[PDB]
Amino acid sequence: MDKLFSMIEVEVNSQCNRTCWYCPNSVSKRKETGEMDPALYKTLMEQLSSLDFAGRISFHFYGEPLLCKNLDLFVGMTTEYIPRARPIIYTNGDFLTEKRLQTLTELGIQKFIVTQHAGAKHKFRGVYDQLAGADKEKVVYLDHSDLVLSNRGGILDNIPANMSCMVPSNLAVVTVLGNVLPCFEDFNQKMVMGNIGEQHISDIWHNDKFTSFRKMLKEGHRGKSDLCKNCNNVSVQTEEQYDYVL
Ligand SMILES: C[S@@+](CC[C@H](N)C(=O)[O-])C[C@H]1O[C@@H](n2cnc3c(N)ncnc32)[C@H](O)[C@@H]1O
Numbered sequence: 207m208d209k210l211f212s213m214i215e216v217e218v219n220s221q222c223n224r225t226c227w228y229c230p231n232s233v234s235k236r237k238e239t240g241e242m243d244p245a246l247y248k249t250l251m252e253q254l255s256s257l258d259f260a261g262r263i264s265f266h267f268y269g270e271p272l273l274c275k276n277l278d279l280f281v282g283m284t285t286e287y288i289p290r291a292r293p294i295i296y297t298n299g300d301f302l303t304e305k306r307l308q309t310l311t312e313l314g315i316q317k318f319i320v321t322q323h324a325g326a327k328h329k330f331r332g333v334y335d336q337l338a339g340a341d342k343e344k345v346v347y348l349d350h351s352d353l354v355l356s357n358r359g360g361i362l363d364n365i366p367a368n369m370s371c372m373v374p375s376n377l378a379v380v381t382v383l384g385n386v387l388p389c390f391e392d393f394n395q396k397m398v399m400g401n402i403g404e405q406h407i408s409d410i411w412h413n414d415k416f417t418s419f420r421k422m423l424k425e426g427h428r429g430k431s432d433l434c435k436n437c438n439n440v441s442v443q444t445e446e447q448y449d450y451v452l
């Protein structure tokens with residue numbers, strides 16, 4: 207029986223305020239849009255609770271989590287249902303004030319992965335520079351120039367263990383409508399594994415499609431998948447839970 211995912215990334219809202227040249231938002235729109243139905247997030251929390259999920263949970267796919275109107279609710283529910291899990295927010299930081307950071311931290315966020323992206327310098331620069339140490343220690347502050355740019359499953363043409371990949375052995379994405387993907391690169395949802403409104407995520411994780419896919423990619427057979435065949439992402443090649451990889 208395959209190990210449960212150690213990481214789950216939830217699309218609590220589909221939209222972003224930016225259109226980075228190295229992001230599919232610059233060239234396509236998400237095929238699902240909106241904010242996650244609170245009842246669906248509750249269903250996800252019930253399922254993760256039933257598994258004693260204690261890995262990383264994050265709140266983005268290709269949108270900006272601080273735009274989620276129910277972010278406070280969802281972070282609070284995370285702490286209530288899966289107190290052993292590690293909530294980590296990746297954010298462009300454009301909306302991240304000190305007050306916002308502190309509210310989120312109090313509700314359960316353990317780390318913020320904040321990236322200053324191409325274009326306008328955000329106000330978080332000055333906020334970060336003024337943060338007390340205890341808050342500052344909770345932030346990994348990246349520039350987009352620090353990222354190891356992936357072509358996002360071959361969507362981006364302007365972007366140039368070997369080929370092994372462990373993402374689908376370690377991680378699941380839940381889209382805003384509850385569809386489960388095996389990788390965060392699957393912007394176009396080429397590999398929907400199931401929907402958590404119809405099946406328990408554990409059963410989806412362990413189904414033949416998902417089990418076969420993760421074995422295939424562990425062996426480095428990217429060529430056998432429309433999702434992976436042109437993918438240049440080699441950042442996740444071990445079995446370990448991570449907070450972030452560049
Ligand atoms: C798709 S972004 C989504 C969350 C939020 N919108 C943000 O930018 O932080 C998830 C993470 O991937 C990083 N990222 C964006 N484009 C990337 C790319 N082409 N290759 C690798 N990482 C990328 C972002 O900086 C962010 O840390």
Ligand SMILES: N[C@H]1C[C@@H](O)[C@H](O)[C@@H](O)[C@@H]1O
Pocket residue numbers: 215390441449450451452
């Ligand atoms: N390098 C980043 C890329 C991001 O899209 C994934 O969601 C995150 O898990 C990774 O750590």
Ligand code: SF4
Pocket residue numbers: 222223224225226228229230231232267268269270298323
């Ligand atoms: S801020 Fe994040 S989601 Fe938005 S366009 Fe840039 S990389 Fe994509």
Ligand code: SF4
Pocket residue numbers: 359371372373374388389390391392423428433434437438439
């Ligand atoms: S090869 Fe690329 S698209 Fe396929 S699972 Fe790995 S990171 Fe995702």
